[PDB]
Amino acid sequence: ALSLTADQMVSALLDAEPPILYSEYDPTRPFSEASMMGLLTNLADRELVHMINWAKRVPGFVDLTLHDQVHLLESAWLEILMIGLVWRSMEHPGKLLFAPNLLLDRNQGKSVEGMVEIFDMLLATSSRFRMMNLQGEEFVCLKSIILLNSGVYTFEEKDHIHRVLDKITDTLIHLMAKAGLTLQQQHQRLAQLLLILSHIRHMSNKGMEHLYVVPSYDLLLEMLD
Amino acid sequence: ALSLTADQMVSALLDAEPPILYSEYDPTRPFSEASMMGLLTNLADRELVHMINWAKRVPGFVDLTLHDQVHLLESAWLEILMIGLVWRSMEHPGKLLFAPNLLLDRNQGKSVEGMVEIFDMLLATSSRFRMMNLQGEEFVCLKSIILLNSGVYTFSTLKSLEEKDHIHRVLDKITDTLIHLMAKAGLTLQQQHQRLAQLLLILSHIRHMSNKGMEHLYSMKNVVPSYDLLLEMLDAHRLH
Ligand SMILES: O=C(c1ccccc1)N1[C@H](c2ccc(OC[C@@H]3CCN(CCCF)C3)cc2)c2ccc(O)cc2CC12CC2
Ligand SMILES: O=C(c1ccccc1)N1[C@H](c2ccc(OC[C@@H]3CCN(CCCF)C3)cc2)c2ccc(O)cc2CC12CC2
Numbered sequence: 001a002l003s004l005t006a007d008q009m010v011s012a013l014l015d016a017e018p019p020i021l022y023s024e025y026d027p028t029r030p031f032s033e034a035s036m037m038g039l040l041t042n043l044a045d046r047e048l049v050h051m052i053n054w055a056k057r058v059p060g061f062v063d064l065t066l067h068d069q070v071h072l073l074e075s076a077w078l079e080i081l082m083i084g085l086v087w088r089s090m091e092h093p094g095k096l097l098f099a100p101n102l103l104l105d106r107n108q109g110k111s112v113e114g115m116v117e118i119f120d121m122l123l124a125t126s127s128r129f130r131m132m133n134l135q136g137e138e139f140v141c142l143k144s145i146i147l148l149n150s151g152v153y154t155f156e157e158k159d160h161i162h163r164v165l166d167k168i169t170d171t172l173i174h175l176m177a178k179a180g181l182t183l184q185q186q187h188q189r190l191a192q193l194l195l196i197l198s199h200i201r202h203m204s205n206k207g208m209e210h211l212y213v214v215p216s217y218d219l220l221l222e223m224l225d
Numbered sequence: 226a227l228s229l230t231a232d233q234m235v236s237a238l239l240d241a242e243p244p245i246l247y248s249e250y251d252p253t254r255p256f257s258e259a260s261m262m263g264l265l266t267n268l269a270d271r272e273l274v275h276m277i278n279w280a281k282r283v284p285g286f287v288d289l290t291l292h293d294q295v296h297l298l299e300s301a302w303l304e305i306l307m308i309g310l311v312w313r314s315m316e317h318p319g320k321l322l323f324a325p326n327l328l329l330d331r332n333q334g335k336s337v338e339g340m341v342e343i344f345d346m347l348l349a350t351s352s353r354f355r356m357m358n359l360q361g362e363e364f365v366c367l368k369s370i371i372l373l374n375s376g377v378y379t380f381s382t383l384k385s386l387e388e389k390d391h392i393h394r395v396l397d398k399i400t401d402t403l404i405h406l407m408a409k410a411g412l413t414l415q416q417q418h419q420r421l422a423q424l425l426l427i428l429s430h431i432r433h434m435s436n437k438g439m440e441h442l443y444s445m446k447n448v449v450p451s452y453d454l455l456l457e458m459l460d461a462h463r464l465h
Contacts, residue, residue: 124378145426153349153430162423169422170415184401187418191400192393194425195370199378201429205436 001060002167006174009059009167013140016057018050020088023102033111036104043099044081048215051080052223058144060164068157070220075151077215078204080143086125086200087139093130096122114210121203128196132189135179141172142193146200226285227398231405234284234398238365241282243275245313248327258336261329268323269306273450276305277458283369285395293380293388295455300376302450304435305368311347311431312364315354321347339441346434353427357420360410366403367424370396375432 004012023039025031055073056062062069088097095105096119109119134142145168148161172193176186208214229237248264280298281287287294313322321344322328334344373392380389403424407417442448 121378128378149426149429153346153353153433165422165426166419169419173418183414184404187404187421188397188400190418191396191403191421191425194422195374195396195428197426198374198429198432202375202432202436205433209440 001063002163004059004167006171009171010137010140010175012057012059013144014137016054017140018047018054018084021046021050021099023099025101027101033108036108036111039102040098043102047081047084048077049223051077052220055147056224058147060160060167061147063160064157066221066224068155068161069224070217071155072147072151072161073220074215074217075154076147077220078207079146079150079200082122082125082203082207083139083143083146083200086122086129087134089122089126090129090134093127094123096126118203118207118210121199121206125196125199125203128199132192132196134193135175137175138172138193141168141175142197144168145194146197149197150201226288227394229284229398231402234402235362235365235406237282237284238369239362241279242365243272243279243309246271246275246324248324250326258333261333262337264327265323268327272306272309273302274458276302277455280372281459283372285391285398286372288391289388290384291456291460293385294459295452296380297372297376298455298459299450299452300379301372302455303438304371304375304431307347307350307434307438308368308371308431311350311354312359314347314351315359318352318355319348321351337445339444343434343437343441346430346437350427350430350434353430357423359424360406362406363403363424366399366406367428370399370425371428371431374428 021043023043025039052073055069064072085096085098089095092103095103096109097103106116106119106123109116145165148165148168152158152161169190172190173186176189181189246268248268254260277298280294286297289297310321310323314320317328320328320330321334331341331344331348334341373396377389377392400421403421404417407420412420439449
């Protein structure tokens with residue numbers, strides 16, 4: 001699984017991308033903020049399926065035991081939803097593209113107490129992506145790093161995960177070298193991208209407090225087939 | 226500030242290292258679970274004062290506005306406490322070295338509700354440092370990154386923008402320094418960016434523990450250093 005090349009790594013990651021899901025909002029009925037969280041919960045529940053099937057296609061993931069595959073997914077699912085949302089909303093300044101038929105701004109995000117604080121953190125990350133000019137090849141790499149690194153500190157099983165993590169790091173550097181960046185530009189950009197992952201984790205924790213709901217071990221396992 | 230060589234970065238960060246503090250000594254008062262949180266709170270408060278002095282000596286930190294210096298320490302003070310604890314406990318498997326005379330295991334962490342969950346995460350990070358053989362020069366770099374990165378996405382004036390641009394230049398200088406250290410230690414170029422990535426990914430877990438811990442301090446609640454308190458220690462005058 002780790003004999004793939006950097007170019008083959010990106011190729012596998014790109015073709016494994018989940019689809020962009022729509023809201024079940026009846027587009028001819030009056031939209032309402034009281035029903036806003038209903039749409040966002042159903043949407044996220046349906047994105048989790050496609051996320052599971054994306055994870056099995058992350059090179060090296062299915063080499064772990066099913067028990068470990070679940071644990072990483074329990075620990076990373078919210079972070080992956082957020083980085084996906086931030087990615088979709090990247091070309092929509094000041095708004096979050098939850099779905100093509102759910103574009104919200106922070107001024108629709110004050111409907112519930114404790115929401116706009118999370119909203120602004122998501123908007124800030126999207127602005128950071130926009131300044132970074134984050135490439136889709138980098139994005140699928142950052143997303144795979146989240147999947148593998150989120151639950152590794154909460155457990156040969158660990159050593160393999162670290163070999164895949166090192167391999168993704170090789171691929172990120174390969175992209176930056178193929179783009180013409182110098183070596184310092186390469187290790188500076190790699191650093192900047194990984195420091196963003198700290199904010200996404202923080203967003204996840206603060207996100208989870210607001211929601212407190214969590215996908216059970218059995219549900220993630222059923223989805224894993 | 227930005228002129229410094231990596232070598233000059235490292236000595237500055239090493240010279241700024243706060244001292245290792247102690248809990249109170251008393252041979253007639255045997256350790257009990259009862260006074261633990263009182264000991265730990267007193268130790269945190271005393272460390273916080275020394276943390277301020279270290280922060281002011283992190284190159285480029287006082288170039289920021291005083292208002293943004295506080296927000297960064299508001300955002301990072303707990304992270305810096307834990308990573309300092311993890312560093313002290315690195316050489317002591319299965320224990321957390323809050324002080325040389327306050328070394329605890331997780332059976333003592335079981336005393337307080339919800340504590341052993343964070344206690345076990347701190348030991349896992351200590352073990353992660355152990356199995357990477359984290360060096361002291363890398364340590365002080367990671368601590369400086371936490372100080373500047375943790376609070377930076379949560380500030381948006383024209384001045385706010387040049388603060389953040391300045392922070393990114395310092396963080397860029399630290400990344401250079403980490404690479405220079407790892408190159409100086411004799412790693413190949415692949416192992417350098419692989420180790421840099423391993424180092425920085427730990428910062429994601431340290432953020433995770435800090436949010437976990439912040440939640441736990443509030444479960445039993447004046448828990449956090451306030452803005453005016455942080456400003457007070459930061460906003461020194463020139464009369465000394
Ligand atoms: O609304 C919000 C939000 C809130 C405050 C500020 C900004 C955004 N969210 C959305 C959201 C809602 C409920 C939810 O709940 C957890 C699942 C629902 C039960 N699932 C378990 C089933 C158990 F019965 C898991 C998850 C995700 C959602 C949806 C899609 C997206 O791409 C991204 C997001 C982002 C965000 C994660 C922060
Ligand atoms: O016990 C714990 C702990 C808990 C659960 C699991 C494992 C460990 N901690 C210790 C701790 C306790 C209370 C505290 O409380 C907040 C300040 C005390 C009042 N301060 C505000 C008062 C001013 F208004 C701020 C801070 C720090 C402490 C001490 C020293 C250290 O180096 C590190 C730590 C780490 C840790 C932070 C997690």
